[PDB]
Enzyme design. Structure first.
Site, PDB file in Angstrom:
ATOM      1  N   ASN B  51      -8.879  -3.368 -11.237  1.00 50.05           N
ATOM      2  CA  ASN B  51      -8.714  -4.837 -11.222  1.00 50.05           C
ATOM      3  C   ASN B  51      -8.598  -5.619 -12.030  1.00 50.05           C
ATOM      4  O   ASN B  51      -9.499  -5.082 -13.346  1.00 50.05           O
ATOM      5  CB  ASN B  51     -10.093  -5.553  -9.828  1.00 50.05           C
ATOM      6  N   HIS B  62      -5.385  -6.193  -7.618  1.00 42.24           N
ATOM      7  CA  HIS B  62      -6.789  -5.870  -7.291  1.00 42.24           C
ATOM      8  C   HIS B  62      -6.421  -4.268  -7.580  1.00 42.24           C
ATOM      9  O   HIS B  62      -5.371  -4.040  -8.520  1.00 42.24           O
ATOM     10  CB  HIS B  62      -7.134  -5.590  -5.157  1.00 42.24           C
ATOM     11  N   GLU B  64      -6.051  -1.646  -6.549  1.00 42.83           N
ATOM     12  CA  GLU B  64      -5.067  -0.986  -6.067  1.00 42.83           C
ATOM     13  C   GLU B  64      -3.463  -0.764  -6.215  1.00 42.83           C
ATOM     14  O   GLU B  64      -2.275  -0.461  -6.614  1.00 42.83           O
ATOM     15  CB  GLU B  64      -5.059  -0.865  -4.383  1.00 42.83           C
ATOM     16  N   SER B  89     -13.167   0.471   0.148  1.00 37.29           N
ATOM     17  CA  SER B  89     -11.772   0.742   1.470  1.00 37.29           C
ATOM     18  C   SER B  89     -10.808  -0.798   1.021  1.00 37.29           C
ATOM     19  O   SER B  89     -11.700  -1.285   0.514  1.00 37.29           O
ATOM     20  CB  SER B  89     -12.786   0.789   2.711  1.00 37.29           C
ATOM     21  N   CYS B  91      -8.136  -3.500   1.341  1.00 35.08           N
ATOM     22  CA  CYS B  91      -8.544  -5.184   1.950  1.00 35.08           C
ATOM     23  C   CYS B  91      -6.789  -4.500   2.893  1.00 35.08           C
ATOM     24  O   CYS B  91      -5.929  -4.163   2.677  1.00 35.08           O
ATOM     25  CB  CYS B  91      -8.612  -6.338   1.000  1.00 35.08           C
ATOM     26  N   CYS B  94      -3.250  -4.139   0.343  1.00 34.50           N
ATOM     27  CA  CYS B  94      -4.146  -3.021  -0.699  1.00 34.50           C
ATOM     28  C   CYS B  94      -3.210  -2.383   0.491  1.00 34.50           C
ATOM     29  O   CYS B  94      -2.286  -1.183  -0.025  1.00 34.50           O
ATOM     30  CB  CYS B  94      -5.083  -3.126  -0.965  1.00 34.50           C
TER      31      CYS B  94
HETATM   32 ZN   LIG Z   1      -6.684  -5.480  -2.352  1.00 36.68          ZN
HETATM   33 ZN   LIG Z   2      -9.815  -4.428  -3.025  1.00 30.28          ZN
END
Ligand SMILES: [Zn+2]
Ligand SMILES: [Zn+2]
Ligand SMILES: [Ca+2]
Ligand SMILES: [Zn+2]
Ligand SMILES: [Zn+2]
EC number: 3.5.4.1
Lengths: 161, 158
Positions: B51, B62, B64, B89, B91, B94
């Site tokens: 991030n 983020h 990912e 996990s 969002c 992503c």
């Molecule tokens: Zn995300």
């Molecule tokens: Zn995230």
């Protein structure tokens, strides 16, 4: 999606938002990039939180779609600032850009056109509680079709094909 | 690659790199979420990242997304046989990136500190989702949430 979805109503700021989004797409096109642009506007007063265009070719970016670039240009914001805003995009959003709208809780998305491209995101936005308006802007359709026709492999790269 | 539920031979390598990225981000003063993208065909790490909200004042990087950006522009077919590793996990954004690029597998460190509707949406869309419940990831993420709750909420648009 649902058989009961319906396009959203027009907002007084839609001409302004689409014109800025298109201007961003045209700027990107002249810069040699994918002609997709956008902007984020506060529905309450028409203020522009940010605007941007695809930067795949300009920055060698795999994530800066027009919508993502627009959000990046708005800068860090508290979650509440995204409430009651509209994200204007010259082209119907892919699954990633749709996810950005959903994650930040931007309630409304105004789409220039969905003729040259459409993903499952357009309907998924409605399923998730967002309003979507497709305006079928001829300027957007023309510039996007030109790019797809002249540089097909570059377009395919932008949508991961 | 079709696992049938079996872990991939590269999964430990991918989760360890994702965790390393999260730890590096934490030391840099950022949100401790890291990831990496591995080519399932040969185990090559296409890219890794974490991030960058605080490091770069970024609303979209983020873990990912930063991971995908760090891989650079790629031919679409490359993604179709990769695995994206993330310490937390995904969002909805992503999740959408994984779906758009057609990355078949998403291996997740944990979904205790956070989980969006994206975890299940990935399954609806045909992807394989693996949740490892990695305590190293869980611990560093919980520490950040405990110390900087408002910064955490900002990262997930709350
Ligand atoms: Zn995300
Ligand atoms: Zn995230
Ligand atoms: Ca409404
Ligand atoms: Zn797009
Ligand atoms: Zn997109």
């Amino acid at each position: 999606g649902s058989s009961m979805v319906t396009g959203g109503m027009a907002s007084k700021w839609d001409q302004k938002g689409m014109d800025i989004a298109y201007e961003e797409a045209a700027l990107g096109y002249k810069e040699g990039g994918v002609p997709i642009g956008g902007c984020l506007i506060n529905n309450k007063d028409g203020s522009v939180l940010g605007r941007g265009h695809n930067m795949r070719f300009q920055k060698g970016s795999a994530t800066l779609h027009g919508e993502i670039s627009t959000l990046e240009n708005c800068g860090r914001l508290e979650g509440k600032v995204y409430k009651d805003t509209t994200l204007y995009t010259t082209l119907s959003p892919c699954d990633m850009c749709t996810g950005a709208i959903i994650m930040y809780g931007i309630p409304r998305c105004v789409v220039g056109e969905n003729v040259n491209f459409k993903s499952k995101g357009e309907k998924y936005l409605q399923t998730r509680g967002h309003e979507v308006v497709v305006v079928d802007d001829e300027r957007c359709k023309k510039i996007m079709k030109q790019f797809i026709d002249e540089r097909p492999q570059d377009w395919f790269e932008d949508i991961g094909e």
